Amino acid sequence: GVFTFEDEITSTVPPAKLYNAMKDADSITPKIIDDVKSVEIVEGNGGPGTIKKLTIVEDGETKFILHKVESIDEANYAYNYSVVGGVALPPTAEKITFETKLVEGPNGGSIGKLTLKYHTKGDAKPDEEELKKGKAKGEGLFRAIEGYVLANPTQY
Numbered sequence: 001g002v003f004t005f006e007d008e009i010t011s012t013v014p015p016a017k018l019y020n021a022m023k024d025a026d027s028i029t030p031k032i033i034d035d036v037k038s039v040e041i042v043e044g045n046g047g048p049g050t051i052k053k054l055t056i057v058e059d060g061e062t063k064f065i066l067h068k069v070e071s072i073d074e075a076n077y078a079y080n081y082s083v084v085g086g087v088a089l090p091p092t093a094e095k096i097t098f099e100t101k102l103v104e105g106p107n108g109g110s111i112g113k114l115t116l117k118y119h120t121k122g123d124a125k126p127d128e129e130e131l132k133k134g135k136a137k138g139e140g141l142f143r144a145i146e147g148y149v150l151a152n153p154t155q156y
């Protein structure tokens, strides 16, 4: 079945800037986040259907994660992608989708909105430990992209 929920996060960076920065996440993320070593395109032109392989290291072991780009709407500061393989997909789960939107926040910042859709195989229930771990990783990612923009004000 599908399990859906929604979370929010804030930034002092305005949404057009932050959105443009999110497009360069493949190049930014490896620099800032210790564990992420590379992000490579396995197939596609970056738009919908593109498959990406993320290489990380946790506790000395090199692991990989597979993302698929679902859709892109630049007018509405929106990017949707799914985890479709690797360590971040648990064996009980078919797929985990992240639907992301940025909106104008108060005080010239941004509000980021995430809808998370966790698709399970059969009667299996979503893994709470993997969810908790996921939220921490997603937060980190957002802060890293924000951090880059704040630390490099001339770019964007």
Ligand SMILES: O=c1c(O)c(-c2ccc(O)c(O)c2)oc2cc(O)cc(O)c12
Binding pocket: 025, 026, 029, 035, 036, 039, 054, 056, 058, 065, 088, 137, 141
């Ligand atoms: O699941 C993960 C993930 O998605 C990201 C991430 C990295 C770069 C990107 O450009 C992006 O969109 C996401 O980092 C991670 C780092 C970890 O140590 C463990 C994970 O499980 C993830």
Ligand SMILES: O=c1c(O)c(-c2ccc(O)c(O)c2)oc2cc(O)cc(O)c12
Binding pocket: 007, 008, 009, 022, 025, 079, 099, 100, 101, 102, 112, 113, 114, 135, 138, 139, 140, 141, 142
């Ligand atoms: O709302 C959110 C959001 O949009 C993003 C995000 C991630 C990758 C992208 O490429 C992107 O454009 C946005 O991460 C988040 C992480 C959280 O812990 C909570 C959130 O609310 C978001």
Ligand SMILES: O=c1c(O)c(-c2ccc(O)c(O)c2)oc2cc(O)cc(O)c12
Binding pocket: 006, 007, 008, 088, 098, 114, 116, 130, 131, 132, 133, 134, 135, 136, 137, 138, 139, 141
């Ligand atoms: O379970 C979650 C999860 O996996 C991710 C996530 C986001 C971006 C990534 O690049 C990533 O690998 C994971 O965010 C979350 C954000 C929440 O607010 C709550 C969650 O439960 C998750």
Ligand code: NA
Binding pocket: 029, 030, 031, 032, 033, 034, 035, 036, 037
């Ligand atoms: Na790194």
